[PDB]
Design a protein around this motif. Structure first.
Motif, PDB file in Angstrom:
ATOM      1  N   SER A 267       4.017   1.459  -1.035  1.00  0.00           N
ATOM      2  CA  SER A 267       4.712   1.550  -2.319  1.00  0.00           C
ATOM      3  C   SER A 267       3.810   2.129  -3.411  1.00  0.00           C
ATOM      4  O   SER A 267       4.250   2.948  -4.228  1.00  0.00           O
ATOM      5  CB  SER A 267       5.212   0.165  -2.721  1.00  0.00           C
ATOM      6  N   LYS A 268       2.551   1.719  -3.441  1.00  0.00           N
ATOM      7  CA  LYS A 268       1.647   2.187  -4.487  1.00  0.00           C
ATOM      8  C   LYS A 268       1.284   3.652  -4.268  1.00  0.00           C
ATOM      9  O   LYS A 268       1.263   4.440  -5.223  1.00  0.00           O
ATOM     10  CB  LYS A 268       0.411   1.288  -4.542  1.00  0.00           C
ATOM     11  N   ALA A 269       1.043   4.042  -3.012  1.00  0.00           N
ATOM     12  CA  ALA A 269       0.762   5.442  -2.710  1.00  0.00           C
ATOM     13  C   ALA A 269       1.907   6.344  -3.147  1.00  0.00           C
ATOM     14  O   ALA A 269       1.681   7.424  -3.720  1.00  0.00           O
ATOM     15  CB  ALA A 269       0.440   5.615  -1.227  1.00  0.00           C
TER      16      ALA A 269
ATOM     17  N   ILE B  64       1.802   6.558  -7.107  1.00  0.00           N
ATOM     18  CA  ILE B  64       0.715   7.435  -7.544  1.00  0.00           C
ATOM     19  C   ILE B  64       1.064   8.899  -7.277  1.00  0.00           C
ATOM     20  O   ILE B  64       0.848   9.779  -8.131  1.00  0.00           O
ATOM     21  CB  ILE B  64      -0.596   7.005  -6.861  1.00  0.00           C
TER      22      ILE B  64
ATOM     23  N   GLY C 183      -1.546  -5.530  -1.605  1.00  0.00           N
ATOM     24  CA  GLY C 183      -1.593  -4.226  -0.952  1.00  0.00           C
ATOM     25  C   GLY C 183      -1.605  -3.080  -1.952  1.00  0.00           C
ATOM     26  O   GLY C 183      -2.307  -2.074  -1.757  1.00  0.00           O
TER      27      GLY C 183
ATOM     28  N   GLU D 159       0.831  -1.201   0.000  1.00  0.00           N
ATOM     29  CA  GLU D 159       0.000   0.000   0.000  1.00  0.00           C
ATOM     30  C   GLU D 159       0.863   1.246   0.000  1.00  0.00           C
ATOM     31  O   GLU D 159       0.577   2.213  -0.720  1.00  0.00           O
ATOM     32  CB  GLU D 159      -0.915   0.018   1.228  1.00  0.00           C
TER      33      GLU D 159
ATOM     34  N   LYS E 296      -4.658  -0.369  -2.253  1.00  0.00           N
ATOM     35  CA  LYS E 296      -4.450   1.066  -2.084  1.00  0.00           C
ATOM     36  C   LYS E 296      -4.900   1.824  -3.328  1.00  0.00           C
ATOM     37  O   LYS E 296      -5.551   2.872  -3.220  1.00  0.00           O
ATOM     38  CB  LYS E 296      -2.985   1.339  -1.741  1.00  0.00           C
TER      39      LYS E 296
ATOM     40  N   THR F 120      -3.667  10.455  -1.550  1.00  0.00           N
ATOM     41  CA  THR F 120      -2.743   9.366  -1.259  1.00  0.00           C
ATOM     42  C   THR F 120      -2.519   9.143   0.231  1.00  0.00           C
ATOM     43  O   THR F 120      -1.998   8.088   0.606  1.00  0.00           O
ATOM     44  CB  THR F 120      -1.371   9.633  -1.896  1.00  0.00           C
TER      45      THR F 120
ATOM     46  N   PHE G  35      -3.720   7.967 -13.071  1.00  0.00           N
ATOM     47  CA  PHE G  35      -2.965   8.074 -11.821  1.00  0.00           C
ATOM     48  C   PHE G  35      -2.873   6.746 -11.078  1.00  0.00           C
ATOM     49  O   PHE G  35      -1.832   6.443 -10.481  1.00  0.00           O
ATOM     50  CB  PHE G  35      -3.576   9.141 -10.916  1.00  0.00           C
TER      51      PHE G  35
END
Lengths: 46, 46
Positions: A14-16, A19, B11, A12, B15, A37, B36
């Motif tokens: 890493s993805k935030a 983005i 995860g 989570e 997210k 985010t 995004f």
């Protein structure tokens, strides 16, 4: 927590960050990136 | 892949869906949400 939930949390985060990087390059206002985010200003700086 | 990398991927997907939900409620254009977050239109619908 468990190791599975810790690994999901790493994904989570890493993805935030990814983005947020895209939004930064596209000119999204920084206060909006933080709202969408959930990232702190020091997380955006690094 | 490994179980750790599969859990990180879960995860990342969790997210991305959450960020997309926030953006949807804030009126972000749907083509931008997809750019995004990397999500497909059927992922946004569900």
């Amino acid at each position: 927590m468990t190791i599975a939930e810790r690994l999901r949390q790493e994904g989570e985060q890493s993805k935030a960050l990814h983005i947020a990087k895209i939004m930064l390059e596209s000119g999204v206002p920084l206060a909006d990136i933080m709202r969408f985010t959930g990232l702190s200003e020091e997380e955006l700086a690094a």
